[PDB]
Structures are given as structure tokens and as C-alpha cells.
């Protein structure tokens, strides 16, 4: 007489991750752990339903190194969209998805954007250039003091200098790399060393994005000309 | 002729880059006066670089009893009268230094206020960059002087599109100072 039944859900733990449009990985690094649970519920065949008088938790187990992207990239995920920079990116176990404890497919937070884009409007040009710049004269003088100065201008940020999303207007913003600690997609925006540097270096890639010579490698491979900017 | 207020710690900065001399900007600060209780107008200049430089970000120094107007006291940004030599600038940002300032800067009773300007290209111009007012206090003597300089911070510029750094060595090592004398 019925009846018998199991599923599973993982728990996971998880951190928020940066990436340019241009990128061919999502970095597996942001799963900081992840569990499956196993539950065995049990009891009888309903009217049209079921019942759970019963359910068993089989011991749970550590997956964080079978957990993959399946096929998604940041280039092949990225859409330019007013306002929305995020994506909730599907894990995958045994090459299918999971159900989260609240019977949603598991996923994984990233951000991604366009290189330069400093006020996250989904275009490269000269206000970028003037937003970074305002932004070193801020820290230039205030004692390099990150937390009191919110660098991009774009109502996801609405002036606050903590926003996950100054931190990645600043990962966009620090096209010129600079001298000391190698700085991961993961660094906060006071990590970061954003300056004059910075502002002309977006402002020269916008002046060469906009000249015939150029637009066929800004469209298509725009890192070519980042680095012919920042040689 | 040093108007640096640390220089040593310039000369650091620059002591691998070649030290060629002959020509390059020559940054300045005016000579004024104004009475006790007026407010004084300072102008910083640069000559010899018209159409030769694409960015500057330098920091001014002058004893802190004296206060440059404010445009918006919250954004900390400090009111100016743009000079020729700033035409055609593509961005340029003005702010006062108020929090966080270095020992050297309040051990000799220093207040800052720092000038960036960028241009799309060597559009760089040459005469006044920015005339700044500041109040002279109430009870200021006839015949004080103010001294007028700079602060060196390692990610200020003056700087070309070429981005050759023996340029920008002579701009901040042959940089002159200013004075604001009180008058009756
Ligand atoms: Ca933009
Ligand atoms: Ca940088």
C-alpha cells in the first residue's frame, strides 16, 4: 500500500563575480561550497495527491568540485539591457541542473559588462572618461579613501559608495593596470587604483572607436584595441 | 626657486626618468595682493606648452587660514574662472582636500585643492589654466605674506599623448610658487 519517495536539493554557497562581454569563462571559484541533500519522503497515495507522514534525510554530501557551467559563457550570456547588469547562472551536476531548497534551479550570481563602461549605460565614451576622472580628483583628495566617493553616476549605484555596483563600474574603469598586488575579477573597488591614467585611457579608446580605421576592431575584437590603448 | 613642499619626495618619484632640460611647461602661481576681510584671486598659469600637453592633475598648497569659494560645499568641488590655456578642454575638475590629508600638509598648516584638466589629444593650451578666490581672514595685517606652492602625490600629472615621461619630470621640477600680500 502506497507509497514511496525521494529527491534531491543542494544547498550552495556561493560569491558574486565580474566579467567583461568579451569573456570566454565563467570562474568556478565563486562556488565557495555546495552540498546535496537527499530527503525520502514517504506515506500514501492520495485522492489525486499524495501525503508525507514520513521523510528521511540520507547523510549529505560535498559536490563544490563536480559543480560545472555547463555551456554558458560571459560572451555568450551578456544582453545590453537598460539598468540590469546581473544573470543567475545555472549549475550543473552529472551534467543536468539542481533544484535549490526552495525548488528553483541552483545558480550562481555574475555581473557582466563592457570594458570602460564606468556610469553602466551599455556604451563606451567620453562620459565615462568624465565620470573616472571626476573620481580620481575625489580620491585625490580625500586621501585615497575609496568608501566616501561612489564612481559611477548610474541610479544602480544612486550615490552610494558601498554598491556592488560601484565595484564593478570600477572593475569596468581600471582599463590601465597599475603597479603592485595582481588584482583578480574578485577585487573591491578599494583595491583598485583608479586614476588620471585610467580617464585618458577610456577617453583615447572612445576618440579611436568613433574614426574609420578603427570601428571594424572596436565591434569585433575591442581587447585589441584596448591594449593598443594602454599598450 | 622650490615651491614643492615635498620635493625629496618628488625628486623620488622621477629619479629614473632622464632629466633633459631645455624646453618644457613652466607652471606658475600669481603674485596679488587684497586688503584684510577681501577675497584674493589666485591664478595658476603654465607657459612654453601650448598644443603640447593632453592632461594635468596638480595639487595647490597655501597656509590653511585662508578658504577657496566653494562651488557645492558637499561635492567638495572648488568654484573657478577657466583660463585660455583650458579651452577645448574635453573635462576638467576642481576639489578641495579636506579629509585625510597628509602630516606634511598639516604639520605646516597646509590646505590643498587639487586641478585635474583632460583634453581629447595635445589640445593643452598655454596662459591662466584657473583663477580660484580666497578669503583673506578679517583680522589679517597689513604687509603678511601668503605663500603659495604645491603638494606632490604620486598619481598627479602633466602629461602628453605621447605619454613620454621626461616631459612631465621637467613640468613639476621647474614649477614656481606664489604669494598673496595684504595690503592696507
Ligand atoms: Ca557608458
Ligand atoms: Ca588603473
Same mark, same amino acid.
Request: contains cysteine; hydrophobic residues 35%; negative net charge.
Given at each position: 500500500?502506497?507509497?514511496?519517495?525521494?529527491?534531491?536539493?543542494?544547498?550552495?554557497?556561493?560569491?558574486?563575480?565580474?566579467?567583461?562581454?568579451?569573456?570566454?569563462?565563467?570562474?568556478?571559484?565563486?562556488?565557495?561550497?555546495?552540498?546535496?541533500?537527499?530527503?525520502?519522503?514517504?506515506?500514501?497515495?492520495?485522492?489525486?495527491?499524495?501525503?508525507?507522514?514520513?521523510?528521511?534525510?540520507?547523510?549529505?554530501?560535498?559536490?563544490?568540485?563536480?559543480?560545472?557551467?555547463?555551456?554558458?559563457?560571459?560572451?555568450?550570456?551578456?544582453?545590453?539591457?537598460?539598468?540590469?547588469?546581473?544573470?543567475?547562472?545555472?549549475?550543473?551536476?552529472?551534467?543536468?541542473?539542481?533544484?535549490?531548497?526552495?525548488?528553483?534551479?541552483?545558480?550562481?550570481?555574475?555581473?557582466?559588462?563592457?570594458?570602460?563602461?564606468?556610469?553602466?549605460?551599455?556604451? *563606451? @565614451?567620453?562620459?565615462?572618461?568624465?565620470?573616472?576622472?571626476?573620481?580620481? #580628483?575625489?580620491?585625490?583628495? %580625500? /586621501?585615497? &579613501? $575609496?568608501?566616501?566617493?561612489?564612481?559611477?553616476?548610474?541610479?544602480?549605484?544612486?550615490?552610494?559608495?558601498?554598491?556592488?555596483?560601484?565595484?564593478?563600474?570600477?572593475?569596468?574603469?581600471?582599463?590601465? *593596470? @597599475?603597479?603592485?598586488?595582481?588584482?583578480?575579477?574578485?577585487?573591491?573597488? #578599494?583595491?583598485?587604483?583608479? %586614476? /588620471?591614467? &585610467? $580617464?585618458?585611457?577610456?577617453?583615447?579608446?572612445?576618440?579611436?572607436?568613433?574614426?574609420?580605421?578603427?570601428?571594424?576592431?572596436?565591434?569585433?575584437?575591442?581587447?585589441?584595441?584596448?591594449?593598443?590603448?594602454?599598450? | 626657486?622650490?615651491?614643492?613642499?615635498?620635493?625629496?619626495?618628488?625628486?623620488?618619484?622621477?629619479?629614473?626618468?632622464?632629466?633633459?632640460?631645455?624646453?618644457?611647461?613652466?607652471?606658475?602661481?600669481?603674485?596679488?595682493?587684497?586688503?584684510?576681510?577681501?577675497?584674493?584671486?589666485?591664478?595658476?598659469?603654465?607657459?612654453?606648452?601650448?598644443?603640447?600637453?593632453?592632461?594635468?592633475?596638480?595639487?595647490?598648497?597655501?597656509?590653511?587660514?585662508?578658504?577657496?569659494?566653494?562651488?557645492?560645499?558637499?561635492?567638495?568641488?572648488?568654484?573657478?574662472?577657466?583660463?585660455?590655456?583650458?579651452?577645448?578642454?574635453?573635462?576638467?575638475?576642481?576639489?578641495?582636500?579636506?579629509?585625510?590629508?597628509?602630516?606634511?600638509?598639516?604639520?605646516?598648516?597646509?590646505?590643498?585643492?587639487?586641478?585635474?584638466?583632460?583634453?581629447?589629444?595635445?589640445?593643452?593650451?598655454?596662459?591662466?589654466?584657473?583663477?580660484?578666490?580666497?578669503?583673506?581672514?578679517?583680522?589679517?595685517?597689513?604687509?603678511?605674506?601668503?605663500?603659495?606652492?604645491?603638494?606632490?602625490?604620486?598619481?598627479?600629472?602633466?602629461?602628453?599623448?605621447?605619454?613620454?615621461?621626461?616631459?612631465?619630470?621637467?613640468?613639476?621640477?621647474?614649477?614656481?610658487?606664489?604669494?598673496?600680500?595684504?595690503?592696507?
Amino acid at each position: 500500500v502506497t507509497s514511496a519517495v525521494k529527491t534531491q536539493y543542494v544547498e550552495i554557497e556561493s560569491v558574486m563575480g565580474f566579467y567583461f562581454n568579451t569573456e570566454d569563462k565563467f570562474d568556478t571559484a565563486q562556488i565557495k561550497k555546495a552540498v546535496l541533500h537527499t530527503v525520502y519522503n514517504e506515506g500514501y497515495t492520495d485522492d489525486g495527491v499524495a501525503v508525507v507522514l514520513r521523510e528521511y534525510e540520507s547523510e549529505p554530501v560535498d559536490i563544490t568540485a563536480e559543480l560545472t557551467f555547463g555551456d554558458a559563457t560571459p560572451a555568450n550570456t551578456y544582453k545590453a539591457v537598460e539598468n540590469k547588469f546581473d544573470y543567475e547562472i545555472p549549475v550543473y551536476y552529472n551534467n543536468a541542473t539542481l533544484k535549490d531548497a526552495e525548488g528553483n534551479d541552483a545558480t550562481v550570481t555574475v555581473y557582466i559588462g563592457l570594458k570602460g563602461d564606468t556610469d553602466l549605460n551599455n556604451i *563606451v @565614451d567620453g562620459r565615462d572618461a568624465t565620470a573616472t576622472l571626476t573620481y580620481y #580628483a575625489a580620491t585625490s583628495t %580625500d /586621501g585615497k &579613501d $575609496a568608501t566616501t566617493v561612489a564612481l559611477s553616476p548610474s541610479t544602480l549605484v544612486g550615490g552610494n559608495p558601498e554598491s556592488v555596483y560601484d565595484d564593478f563600474s570600477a572593475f569596468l574603469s581600471d582599463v590601465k *593596470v @597599475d603597479a603592485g598586488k595582481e588584482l583578480t575579477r574578485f577585487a573591491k573597488k #578599494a583595491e583598485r587604483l583608479i %586614476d /588620471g591614467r &585610467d $580617464a585618458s585611457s577610456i577617453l583615447t579608446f572612445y576618440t579611436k572607436s568613433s574614426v574609420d580605421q578603427y570601428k571594424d576592431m572596436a565591434a569585433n575584437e575591442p581587447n585589441k584595441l584596448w591594449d593598443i590603448v594602454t599598450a | 626657486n622650490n615651491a614643492v613642499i615635498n620635493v625629496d619626495e618628488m625628486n623620488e618619484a622621477f629619479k629614473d626618468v632622464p632629466d633633459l632640460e631645455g624646453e618644457g611647461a613652466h607652471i606658475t602661481l600669481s603674485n596679488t595682493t587684497a586688503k584684510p576681510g577681501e577675497m584674493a584671486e589666485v591664478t595658476m598659469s603654465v607657459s612654453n606648452a601650448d598644443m603640447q600637453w593632453n592632461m594635468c592633475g596638480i595639487h595647490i598648497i597655501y597656509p590653511d587660514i585662508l578658504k577657496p569659494e566653494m562651488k557645492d560645499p558637499e561635492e567638495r568641488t572648488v568654484a573657478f574662472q577657466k583660463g585660455d590655456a583650458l579651452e577645448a578642454a574635453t573635462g576638467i575638475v576642481c576639489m578641495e582636500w579636506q579629509e585625510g590629508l597628509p602630516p606634511v600638509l598639516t604639520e605646516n598648516k597646509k590646505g590643498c585643492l587639487f586641478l585635474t584638466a583632460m583634453f581629447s589629444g595635445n589640445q593643452g593650451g598655454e596662459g591662466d589654466m584657473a583663477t580660484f578666490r580666497f578669503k583673506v581672514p578679517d583680522n589679517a595685517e597689513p604687509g603678511a605674506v601668503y605663500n603659495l606652492g604645491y603638494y606632490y602625490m604620486n598619481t598627479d600629472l602633466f602629461i602628453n599623448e605621447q605619454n613620454i615621461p621626461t616631459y612631465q619630470k621637467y613640468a613639476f621640477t621647474h614649477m614656481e610658487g606664489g604669494t598673496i600680500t595684504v595690503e592696507l
